[PDB]
RNA sequence: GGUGAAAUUCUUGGAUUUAUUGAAGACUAACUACUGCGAAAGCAUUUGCCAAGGACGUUUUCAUUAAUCAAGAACGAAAGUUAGGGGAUCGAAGAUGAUCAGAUACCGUCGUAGUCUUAACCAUAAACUAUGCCGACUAGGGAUCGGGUGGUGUUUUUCUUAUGACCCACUCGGCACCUUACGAGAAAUCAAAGUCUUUGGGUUCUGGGGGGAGUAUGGUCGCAAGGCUGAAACUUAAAGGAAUUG
RNA sequence: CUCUAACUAUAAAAAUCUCUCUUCUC
């Protein structure tokens, strides 16, 4: 190793407000939050590639002002009893991360997912439109 | 499209026989190769035919 | 394929053979194989054991082929046939031990229905063996006459 | 009239079976009349494959894999294109639309 | 997005200038002990960050700690305990799967069979392990499908728990961890079931912990350098 | 199949078909003379017995009830009866 | 209409019916 | 947060996310299939105990003990009702925030009863395969589950063998499936919905145009909800089934 | 006569309609 000092991305891409949150190795510090609705106006667009994209260029700046220069990319979806597919902005939150000098190692996924448990919320017929 | 010449020259390609044997054990030094089954076809169809017997794995191949 | 009392459909069973002679190679004697049968059944053994005993460790195909009689019918000549006959004595038995986990365990509903059915063919069972008059015809079937009949 | 033989379900012979819930509605449905589909992708689209392959270090990474079955209903499967209506002589074929690619 | 109906129910500074870098050193069971770097609050007289540090999880793939990539599937989670000052020492606190390999293992068409098992160590660590093991189509098998049936899952069950109680009761997860490197582990359970049934990728994921008896020093200094 | 021989089907056939729906229905089982090494006692033992069948001069099983048929002791010499 | 809710105003009638009945029983 | 889009709501008393953990209750993901068990409902974490059961094997035992069933009985999804326990999620009522001409509906956020249970009731579902049960025969093709036979079969490894796991062949039983009409149907279609004008294997229940109406009344069961049984007066020339072209 | 690989991903609102229907034989 040449002393890359490593943080953790911990990207969270729900259907909405995709989450950009970089922390150290042992995750109890936290540095750099700013989120997918932190840069746009539209107040749904906060989901939108573009908006995880400023996010990302914010963080990386940021770390990299700290002195982190490589990161572990934690891919979550909103998991739980939801949808749990990722989100649209975190991919593109992912590429603007790669792209902003910041060295990649470990890419994981690290949504909850269930032993189908906690009935889901809809009904029984569900969500009608 | 057909005309003359083409369905002439259909015919003749067609007209080609190989003077040499493509049968009767021309190749494999008069010999040619089976199994136990078939060999007994022709021993119980009171023939000689000269054989060559050759187990064919019953394991098949898993494909 | 009948299963008189579920919804089975299978005919596993035994096929008796053609010849009812004695077979060609047996050669123990018939009045040895009901000596062995009358020794078999003092030590306290139904008539479905002694023929399953004398199929497995001796050449006895089957007592009627051997004998002429049939190991039941061999037993009463004797005096040894038992007061309730082994099928009815075996329900008894099965219906006692279900009761028995009924009443360690109310909830249990499936065991309950099964409870039902195996009554229903001790009644069956002992209307035959009543109409033949194997049964004195007060016999019948209530709780701890079971208990009673079975210990 | 019967439109369809095996009534949709594929069931025969069970009576019941636990409903699963739909991931667009959440339309609670019987597990075997609720359309799977085993999404199995890269997380990182062939889009950015090459970004990261530049900008990562452990020299080529396994780049893994990410798998979710979905449990549409069959609304959201007419609807979010997963489904299509077939011709009646068509209803028959169960294979898979023929390999999408070799 | 500045709406906020500041439902409110300078004093500015950066608070990186009062922070600074530990360093999370591996037991001598790992190769590469030089894990990585943590930020820490600056020490306060009142309130001393050695404190703080100890009770930290950090998570470490285990390829991270061996080089090799044979290990790129597994995690291990290292425990804060006991801090040198400019360089803190870490005891073994867990493992896991990675969730990819996982699901890459969890296909259709085979039973998986789960082993779990509740045990003591040599020492009073108290851990608990799962091994989940998948049938395997034979080099043969024209029939498609490889399921087991339920007596054969049930005797590989017991047989991967005795082994599992046999080899956690027999050493301490410092041995326990040198043995879980090199996977000799997953290898003696596939052994030992092959005659029941094939049984691909026999593995051993999530060695959980659930106690730790007082501090135990001697032997955790021991465990370093 | 229209015309066909239901009086002398073939051999081979007869053994293909279920027991129970032969022509005449025979079984398909038989006796065995088996010889434990301990003795020179010949035991008469059926091909689908359902008894650990001993000899009685040892307390040696010669025979294993099976779902099937038995399987011997490992060391018993039997002859088809 | 529907069957449920024709059973269900047929309920309703009862409803009432049954009521007045039960004050004057 | 959330959405088509918004708003209600929570937030510098620092929410949303971040790491360890702790509590509660429910559930048993992925494995999960034209696969299994059960009388039907229904049944999916591990282990032990309790008894039960189908199928197969059987040169074992009794010898018609059987099939279907008015009367009588046992179980009977969800919902609902009495009490005691819990009280996470989701959510009838309700509270609102939207959309609309209206919206006490669908989208959203909270949210009692309920959902989860121990006793006691309830006995209804598109309780559906809308196909009663038992029995016989009739046509070809593969697979699949449980059992059993044989292989001079293959890997297994414990030197060889015994198993196990496969491979090939056969058989019994089960959920099923493909093709076809040479049979049946008004056809959709059915390998039974065939063996029915060439009309009779045994047997139980139900229907006689639609509506009124599964209503009233009279019984009977139920604490209640309601269940079982259940017409007529009158009105009507159709209602309805399958398929063909638009 | 010889083979098991590639992949995504939208749901705004839209109520209603009066007459009158008429043969097919060489
Ligand atoms: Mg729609
Ligand atoms: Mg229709
Ligand atoms: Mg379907
Ligand atoms: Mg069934
Ligand atoms: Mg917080
Ligand atoms: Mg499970
Ligand atoms: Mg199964
Ligand atoms: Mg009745
Ligand atoms: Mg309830
Ligand atoms: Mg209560
Ligand atoms: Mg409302
Ligand atoms: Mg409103
Ligand atoms: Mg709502
Ligand atoms: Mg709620
Ligand atoms: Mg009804
Ligand atoms: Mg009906
Ligand atoms: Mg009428
Ligand atoms: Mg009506
Ligand atoms: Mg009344
Ligand atoms: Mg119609
Ligand atoms: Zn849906
Ligand atoms: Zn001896």
Same mark, same amino acid.
């Given at each position: 190793?040449?002393?890359?000092?490593?943080?953790?991305?911990?990207?969270?891409?729900?259907?909405?407000?995709?989450?950009?949150?970089?922390?150290?190795?042992?995750?109890?510090?936290?540095?750099?939050?700013?989120?997918?609705?932190?840069?746009?106006?539209?107040?749904?667009?906060?989901?939108?590639?573009?908006?995880?994209?400023?996010?990302?260029?914010?963080?990386?700046?940021?770390?990299?002002?700290?002195?982190?220069?490589?990161?572990?990319?934690?891919?979550?979806?909103?998991?739980?009893?939801?949808?749990?597919?990722?989100?649209?902005?975190?991919?593109?939150?992912?590429?603007?991360?790669?792209?902003?000098?910041?060295?990649?190692?470990?890419?994981?996924?690290?949504?909850?997912?269930?032993?189908?448990?906690?009935?889901?919320?809809?009904?029984?017929?569900?969500?009608?439109? | 499209?057909?005309?003359?010449?083409?369905?002439?020259?259909?015919?003749?390609?067609?007209?080609?026989?190989?003077?040499?044997?493509?049968?009767?054990?021309?190749?494999?030094?008069?010999?040619?190769?089976?199994?136990?089954?078939?060999?007994?076809?022709?021993?119980?169809?009171?023939?000689?035919?000269?054989?060559?017997?050759?187990?064919?794995?019953?394991?098949?191949?898993?494909? | 394929?009948?299963?008189?009392?579920?919804?089975?459909?299978?005919?596993?069973?035994?096929?008796?053979?053609?010849?009812?002679?004695?077979?060609?190679?047996?050669?123990?004697?018939?009045?040895?194989?009901?000596?062995?049968? %009358?020794?078999?059944?003092?030590?306290?053994?139904?008539?479905?054991?002694?023929?399953?005993?004398?199929?497995?460790?001796?050449?006895?195909?089957?007592?009627?082929?051997?004998?002429?009689?049939?190991?039941?019918?061999?037993?009463?000549?004797?005096?040894?046939?038992?007061?309730?006959?082994?099928?009815?004595?075996?329900?008894?038995?099965?219906?006692?031990?279900?009761?028995?986990?009924?009443?360690?365990?109310?909830?249990?509903?499936?065991?309950?229905?099964?409870?039902?059915?195996?009554?229903?063919?001790?009644?069956?069972?002992?209307?035959?063996?009543?109409?033949?008059?194997?049964?004195?015809?007060?016999?019948?079937?209530?709780?701890?006459?079971?208990?009673?009949?079975?210990? | 009239?019967?439109?369809?033989?095996?009534?949709?379900?594929?069931?025969?012979?069970?009576?019941?079976?636990?409903?699963?819930?739909?991931?667009?509605?959440?339309?609670?449905?019987?597990?075997?009349?609720?359309?799977?589909?085993?999404?199995?992708?890269?997380?990182?689209?062939?889009?950015?494959?090459?970004?990261?392959?530049?900008?990562?270090?452990?020299?080529?990474?396994?780049?893994?894999?990410?798998?979710?079955?979905?449990?549409?209903?069959?609304?959201?499967?007419?609807?979010?294109?997963?489904?299509?209506?077939?011709?009646?002589?068509?209803?028959?074929?169960?294979?898979?639309?023929?390999?999408?690619?070799? | 997005?500045?709406?906020?109906?500041?439902?409110?129910?300078?004093?500015?500074?950066?608070?990186?200038?009062?922070?600074?870098?530990?360093?999370?050193?591996?037991?001598?069971?790992?190769?590469?002990?030089?894990?990585?770097?943590?930020?820490?609050?600056?020490?306060?007289?009142?309130?001393?960050?050695?404190?703080?540090?100890?009770?930290?999880?950090?998570?470490?793939?285990?390829?991270?700690?061996?080089?090799?990539?044979?290990?790129?599937?597994?995690?291990?989670?290292?425990?804060?305990?006991?801090?040198?000052?400019?360089?803190?020492?870490?005891?073994?606190?867990?493992?896991?799967?990675?969730?990819?390999?996982?699901?890459?293992?969890?296909?259709?068409?085979?039973?998986?069979?789960?082993?779990?098992?509740?045990?003591?160590?040599?020492?009073?660590?108290?851990?608990?392990?799962?091994?989940?093991?998948?049938?395997?189509?034979?080099?043969?098998?024209?029939?498609?499908?490889?399921?087991?049936?339920?007596?054969?899952?049930?005797?590989?069950?017991?047989?991967?728990?005795?082994?599992?109680?046999?080899?956690?009761?027999?050493?301490?997860?410092?041995?326990?961890?040198?043995?879980?490197?090199?996977?000799?582990?997953?290898?003696? %359970?596939?052994?030992?079931?092959?005659?029941?049934?094939?049984?691909?990728?026999?593995?051993?994921?999530?060695?959980?912990?659930?106690?730790?008896?007082?501090?135990?020093?001697?032997?955790?200094?021991?465990?370093?350098? | 199949?229209?015309?066909?021989?239901?009086?002398?089907?073939?051999?081979?056939?007869?053994?293909?078909?279920?027991?129970?729906?032969?022509?005449?229905?025979?079984?398909?089982?038989?006796?065995?003379?088996?010889?434990?090494?301990?003795?020179?006692? %010949?035991?008469?033992?059926?091909?689908?017995?359902?008894?650990?069948?001993?000899?009685?001069?040892?307390?040696?099983?010669?025979?294993?009830?099976?779902?099937?048929?038995?399987?011997?002791?490992?060391?018993?010499?039997?002859?088809?009866? | 209409?529907?069957?449920?809710?024709?059973?269900?105003?047929?309920?309703?009638?009862?409803?009432?019916?049954?009521?007045?009945?039960?004050?004057?029983?």
């Amino acid at each position: 190793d040449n002393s890359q000092v490593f943080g953790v991305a911990r990207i969270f891409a729900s259907f909405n407000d995709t989450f950009v949150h970089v922390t150290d190795l042992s995750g109890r510090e936290t540095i750099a939050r700013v989120t997918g609705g932190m840069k746009v106006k539209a107040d749904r667009d906060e989901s939108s590639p573009y908006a995880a994209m400023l996010a990302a260029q914010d963080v990386a700046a940021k770390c990299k002002e700290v002195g982190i220069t490589a990161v572990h990319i934690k891919i979550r979806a909103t998991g739980g009893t939801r949808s749990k597919t990722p989100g649209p902005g975190g991919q593109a939150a992912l590429r603007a991360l790669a792209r902003s000098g910041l060295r990649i190692g470990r890419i994981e996924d690290v949504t909850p997912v269930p032993s189908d448990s906690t009935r889901k919320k809809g009904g029984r017929r569900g969500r009608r439109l | 499209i057909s005309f003359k010449l083409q369905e002439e020259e259909r015919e003749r390609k067609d007209q080609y026989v190989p003077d040499v044997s493509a049968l009767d054990l021309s190749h494999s030094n008069d010999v040619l190769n089976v199994d136990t089954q078939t060999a007994e076809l022709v021993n119980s169809l009171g023939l000689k035919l000269p054989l060559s017997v050759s187990s064919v794995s019953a394991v098949r191949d898993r494909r | 394929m009948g299963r008189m009392h579920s919804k089975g459909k299978g005919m596993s069973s035994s096929a008796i053979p053609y010849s009812r002679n004695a077979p060609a190679w047996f050669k123990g004697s018939s009045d040895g194989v009901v000596e062995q049968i %009358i020794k078999y059944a003092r030590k306290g053994l139904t008539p479905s054991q002694i023929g399953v005993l004398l199929r497995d460790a001796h050449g006895v195909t089957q007592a009627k082929v051997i004998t002429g009689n049939k190991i039941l019918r061999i037993l009463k000549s004797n005096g040894l046939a038992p007061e309730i006959p082994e099928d009815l004595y075996f329900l008894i038995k099965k219906a006692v031990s279900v009761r028995k986990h009924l009443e360690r365990n109310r909830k249990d509903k499936d065991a309950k229905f099964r409870l039902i059915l195996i009554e229903s063919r001790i009644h069956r069972l002992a209307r035959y063996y009543r109409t033949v008059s194997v049964l004195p015809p007060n016999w019948k079937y209530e709780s701890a006459t079971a208990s009673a009949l079975v210990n | 009239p019967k439109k369809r033989a095996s009534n949709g379900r594929n069931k025969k012979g069970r009576g019941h079976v636990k409903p699963v819930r739909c991931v667009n509605c959440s339309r609670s449905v019987p597990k075997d009349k609720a359309i799977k589909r085993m999404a199995i992708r890269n997380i990182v689209e062939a889009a950015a494959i090459r970004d990261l392959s530049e900008a990562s270090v452990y020299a080529e990474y396994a780049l893994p894999k990410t798998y979710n079955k979905l449990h549409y209903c069959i609304s959201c499967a007419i609807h979010a294109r997963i489904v299509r209506v077939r011709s009646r002589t068509d209803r028959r074929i169960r294979a898979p639309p023929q390999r999408p690619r070799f | 997005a500045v709406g906020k109906n500041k439902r409110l129910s300078k004093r500015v500074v950066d608070p990186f200038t009062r922070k600074e870098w530990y360093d999370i050193k591996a037991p001598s069971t790992f190769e590469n002990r030089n894990v990585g770097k943590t930020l820490v609050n600056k020490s306060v007289g009142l309130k001393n960050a050695s404190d703080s540090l100890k009770g930290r999880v950090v998570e470490v793939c285990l390829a991270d700690l061996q080089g090799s990539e044979d290990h790129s599937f597994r995690k291990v989670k290292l425990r804060v305990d006991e801090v040198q000052g400019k360089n803190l020492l870490t005891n073994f606190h867990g493992m896991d799967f990675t969730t990819d390999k996982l699901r890459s293992m969890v296909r259709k068409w085979q039973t998986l069979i789960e082993a779990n098992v509740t045990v003591k160590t040599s020492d009073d660590y108290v851990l608990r392990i799962f091994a989940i093991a998948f049938t395997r189509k034979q080099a043969n098998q024209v029939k498609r499908t490889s399921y087991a049936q339920s007596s054969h899952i049930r005797q590989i069950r017991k047989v991967i728990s005795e082994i599992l109680t046999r080899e956690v009761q027999n050493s301490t997860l410092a041995q326990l961890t040198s043995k879980l490197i090199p996977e000799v582990i997953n290898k003696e %359970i596939e052994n030992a079931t092959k005659d029941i049934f094939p049984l691909q990728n026999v593995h051993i994921r999530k060695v959980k912990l659930l106690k730790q008896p007082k501090f135990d020093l001697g032997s955790l200094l021991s465990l370093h350098g | 199949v229209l015309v066909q021989d239901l009086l002398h089907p073939t051999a081979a056939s007869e053994a293909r078909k279920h027991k129970l729906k032969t022509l005449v229905q025979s079984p398909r089982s038989h006796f065995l003379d088996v010889k434990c090494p301990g003795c020179l006692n %010949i035991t008469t033992v059926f091909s689908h017995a359902q008894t650990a069948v001993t000899c009685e001069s040892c307390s040696t099983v010669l025979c294993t009830p099976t779902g099937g048929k038995a399987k011997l002791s490992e060391g018993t010499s039997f002859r088809r009866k | 209409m529907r069957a449920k809710w024709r059973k269900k105003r047929t309920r309703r009638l009862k409803r009432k019916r049954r009521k007045v009945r039960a004050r004057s029983k």
